[model samples]
Target: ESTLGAAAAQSGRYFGTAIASGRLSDSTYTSIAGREFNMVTAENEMKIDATEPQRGQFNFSSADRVYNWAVQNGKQVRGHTLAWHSQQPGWMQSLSGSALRQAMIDHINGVMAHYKGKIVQWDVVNEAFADGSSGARRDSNLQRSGNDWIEVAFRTARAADPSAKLCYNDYNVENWTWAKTQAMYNMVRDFKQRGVPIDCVGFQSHFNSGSPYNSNFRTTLQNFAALGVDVAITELDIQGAPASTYANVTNDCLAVSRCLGITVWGVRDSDSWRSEQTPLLFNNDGSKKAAYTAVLDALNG
Candidate 1:
């Protein structure tokens, strides 16, 4: 907890780390207790499979355990995601119309009711856009639902937890297109017209520290802001494939600084979800890489 992350964020950068270790260290708990900023984003849990079908079987264990850790130490928590087409239990397949809507309602209600006021905000719907009207969505569940997940999840969440802020979370949102950014733009605007409860937009920012740099991230987030929704960079991580090195770190950090906070998938070179793909801000012995200074410099501005 008292590692480079805290000190770096203290320099005006909103530094964040995932709770992969399950619990906090005594010293980290103490250090976070002292930090002025205390926003925590749950890396796991808050997903479809976190709990079982029935209301009582809710599995707040992962999210709950983490939130409890944060609350006890004076930190605010960010609910990972309320609904993503992925991680959805087996029951969601083939269901449609009213039955699907009902199942979605129960799921959102179960989640929001549990973390209602405790969380500062939530990713009400995750990746709820078809790449394009003509895009291939029927291939994958994650990409297939289009806006139904959004329609059901947002409606239910608003009804269950009105006090907490809501958001639309997706990766690479910076690009504007019918399949990507443009679709999100359209839906958010529609929600606005209908007086829906959405309050923010979350950019997953799983950027590569390499070519192209996913320039769409900034433009889309700013565009979303124009709709009056606050924007946050959630699930932020810098990946380097094949030839990536220390230099790419600065590039990745610069891309994400435009949002409220930046977080990587996980620290410890071995723990990354993209481990085979290539990444690491810190070496095994906790030595700060040039990426550390690069990130600090990006945040300094």
Candidate 2:
């Protein structure tokens, strides 16, 4: 296979990247992504702030642009983060009591209805657990507004888009025993036992150069797969360890049979959130880096 997308498809997995509407206008950016990737995720365009910046009035033009491009290019789309602890518009987060709960339900239903069949997957709830906590949900506005807000979000999203594979996305799960990661595992186990509508657990897997290469990466995937749910490497990137970071990431994905796919944070380092970090598969000038070659070879194997 000449492209990463082709290689990944041959191996029964997807090679993907998150992109922004602004970056789509860049010919170099679009050329690389369109040729090499099979799936797309809207970086921040689908978030609460971007989609429903106001109370009832919604804006999906930016996100829709990316989705349209994916459809035209024969790529799958992942709806990022219907609910999250951060980046929420102040108006939506300020409500209290039943008003707050109903608002969240309405938001999820409205967003799902707008992009019903176009999306193949969704991060229904993002980062709901506390950092370094022992199985405790965060004390964010959404969590505070209701006892089981995370559950409500997943259930609401399932009702809104039955066909979409719903996922609970969180960071820090890259390391198994990290408090946040442990809490995430316990929460997923409970969801399964209670018959919650959760379908997958997305490990964001952001790492710095100082971070240890966790031998437990594959074990974490296997643990989640044991719950009868899919696992994915969503929003993956490593700072400073460019040479070996991607190699480990690909190995972890291939380690488990139930691992669904891997999505690089963006097409190029320059297009990413921390360009100075240089944490992606392509260089600043949009050329394939060593990490790209490593991933392609691993996927082809």
Candidate 3:
């Protein structure tokens, strides 16, 4: 029964992987996942499009299946996100002013309320910063109505599910000099100063074979931990490249006690969002890759 969870627990962290609902019936996936990861993230099932498929109409069937699987396997769930600029419902795209804010609040509150005690963490707001080191919010619908909406989303989630850890998730923040990274840090700092209900900061760490792995990656974790919050590698995959990046991620988590865990973007290369890039731990035949062996060694080292 020795599992990745066992290794991660020994190191005071969690080893995780993202799961797709379609792969739920694939025992090959279930068997390896059941042994290799302690935490699970819904690849897209819990996202806005999957949840609120038609404005106010909600569907947790797809998302719940993932959660149910996680629970059955004794793994905890991290709700992928409640608000994001991408993958949003088309109906919510046209709203403006107070109505827009209210619509957002309703959606967040609704989702949080439904899975109140089940989710250990919630990505209350995701990818809210502008691309690059601009230190400005993205011009997404929620941000356009005003940045106050971001605060409201977190507050509403806290109100709906008081015990769930609230996180602000984003990518490109792993690269220290990137404007988007700095922007994410600035917001977390501000949120801490203003008493936002934030609990953790998620570094999507969407690095490819081309990504320049920075030594300062741990420094970012330290900075966020210094903000009195936890940090985690929310979506990580090396795009069929260096196994060293997997080591770097686990090392960064070890570098800071506050760095919670690493969630590979998908279980297998074929299931990855960047499938063209072959970004994951397993290959098409449900066999371990060098990256998978490397990750396990890192966790067990």
Candidate 4:
């Protein structure tokens, strides 16, 4: 049918989009998402706040809706994350030292156990590094736990789901020259050297209109791929960029052998996290935008 998913599948890659559970009942939204994407990521339903709101308590009612919908539509699910600093429950922020470490491990173990065989990939740790040239890790309850929390999360996730690809996901890691990108590269290299159970690195390619499309994007992917881990465009959305920018991103993914796939942050611009900026491939009324054709053409080529 010449859909994005079918085009990507021809080259052994996948085309995907992040979806909100609340949008599933909207036929127009589901029709485009299910038809165009072969992979589905929960936009917010799989985050720590959504899954483990209270300490030791679990809730998958919302996440399950997203997962089950993906399963029903024959789409592979990408677990948005197991651990992140934001959107976490209030209870999680109070703990420190061993208590916080225990909570981190317990959360990963508990969440991954529930979705063990269902997920194709899991973003085990998200945005662990802070912004800027220092390449420092972000200050958070996980970081303050003093247990090498990122490694702990990955290992715990691996034990819980041996078959799923464990990924470290972050933004501003698309350009090789960026210190943040190099920091991620070094971490992945260190993980590979020490066998820390990482299978993928996700660059959340969230771009703005003024952001220059880095020519080194493809080089960065290849460099990370050389570290023995797959690379993915986990959260792609170019706010007010030209269609060429979208094509370039897709082509860069195609050029890198280990670049796994691309998952746009959402299906429609109005539903995007950056809704006012309108950064998705579909318009508010579900019509395909130029970016959609750009991506589809790149995949088909």
Candidate 5:
């Protein structure tokens, strides 16, 4: 936020495919090469147990590649998730309370220490909400990680690498609906007052065009920002839009850009996380979707 003349606006792209490529390309390098951004949200690298490799072996090949790529490109890798319930290695079925905690801490320390000075921000905890009242997020593991898990993780991650920015990320905070939404907000408020090491709040916008409307989105961001935490619009791609004009789409994009940075879930339709959603800026033939200009024009306007 330097002073050019008026306030300088910021723009950023999600740095995911670069990890899959194992090397940066001319276009990929050019897009985010020079810009300053907080690299974050680990992709499949830490997803399946395959991400961990041999039990307690502490694999860094995949994550390291991404970290090194970020460093070479000078991007800050956001530590997306030290501990989460989903996407566990098939083998983790054996671990319980202490063992699970140990594995998580080791992964964070090993990975973070390896890239110690390189990585900047980290999402130590993610999506650990279980609404007792509504039975939302109460499927299985979440119920186990109620209040105690949150405190311990905060303590452990800061102990691992106190230098990096620590964040607590989850969805539905934008909507703040019953189930997941309410559970997340309570954590945020509690974290703020408890003087936890938490630094940022990320909105994982997994919305669909056909899904129910999300009205509390922007207000939630504004409220969170007011809490003195940095706000990020992560994983956003609307589902199903008419191919003609994107007048409505432009408005949606403008509101999103109001955050610190907007990480659209896409550039190409096929690569979009939601093959079912089908809301991408570019179509399959490498042509821009109407929503493309809609977002761009919204940003530029």
Candidate 6:
């Protein structure tokens, strides 16, 4: 197969990218997104701030634009982030205790119910754990609510959309030795033991120019899969790297049976959140980079 998605399909996996609703207007962007990727993630449209800006009221216009496009183009959608510390409205951040918990539940219910069967998976909670030395749960309105908000979010999401897989997503958790990664792993293990309704774990594999290609990446996936939950490479993008960096990520995922797939953060370098760093498989002008060819070869292998 010439296309990345088609090649990945042969191995029963998906090749996906996060897309912005506004970018759909550009025929060039849409053409590549539709033709090359089998799955789609809303870069920010489905987040808490965008979906439920003011209290109980909800909005799905921007999210629907992306979701509708994905469905029409035969791509499965991934509901990015029902709950996160960042990108939250002021109304949500000021609350505490039961009121905060209620708001969280309501937001998850409203968003998940709107998309329901259309979304294949949901990042129920994102970046709940802190980075660096702490490795502790982040101090946010959700954390201060004092009611096990992570489990509450996952349960609420399951009730709203029974078919969609619930995931806990985080960054800086790709390396096994990192404190943040260990904290995340411990949380997942405890969730499994206590029967929390999680289905997958997302590793946001954002790499820098000088980042070493982790030889232990496959082991990390295997360890998580051993916990009986599927794993995914979510929000992947390497800034100023060679084709080998992209190929290593693809090959690592392929080595793990329960590794669902990979989703690059954006379609093109310029479209990336870290745009100045050029962290994606496509160039700004919608041309394939060496990273793209390397990924295709890895998928087809």
CA shift of 117, model 1, Å:
0.8
Per-model C-alpha lDDT, please? 0.61, 0.87, 0.85, 0.90, 0.56, 0.90
Collision count for each candidate, in order: 5, 0, 4, 0, 6, 0
lDDT of 4: 0.90
lDDT of 3: 0.85
What is the per-residue lDDT of model 4 for residues 1-301, given as tens digits with 9 covering 90 to 100?
3898899988899999998999888999999898999999999999998999999999999999999999899899999888899888898888888988888889998999898888999999999998889888988888888637899889888899999999999998898898889999998899899999999999999988444569799999999998889999999999773689999999999999998899999988898999888888999999989988888888989
Q: List residue ranges in candidate 6 displaced over 4 A.
A: 209-212
Worst 10 residues of 5 by lDDT: 1-10
Which candidate, 3 or 5, would have the higher lDDT against the true structure?
A: 3
Candidate 1 lowest-lDDT run of ten = 241-250
- How should the candidates be ordered by lDDT, best one leading? 4, 6, 2, 3, 1, 5
Better of 2 and 5 by lDDT: 2
Q: Could you tell me which residue pairs clash in candidate 4?
A: none
Worst 10 residues of 6 by lDDT: 207-216
The TM-score obtained by model 1 is 0.78
TM-score for each of the candidates: 0.78, 0.96, 0.96, 0.97, 0.77, 0.97
RMSD (Å) per prediction: 4.6, 1.3, 1.5, 1.2, 5.0, 1.2
Q: What lDDT is reached at residue 129 by model 5?
A: 60
Worst 10 residues of 2 by lDDT: 206-215
Candidate 2 clashes between residue pairs 3 or more apart in a chain or in different chains: none
lDDT of 2: 0.87
The candidate, 1 or 5, that scores higher on lDDT is 1
Query: For model 6, what is the C-alpha lDDT against the true structure?
Result: 0.90
In model 6, which residue pairs have backbone atoms overlapping below 3 Å?
none
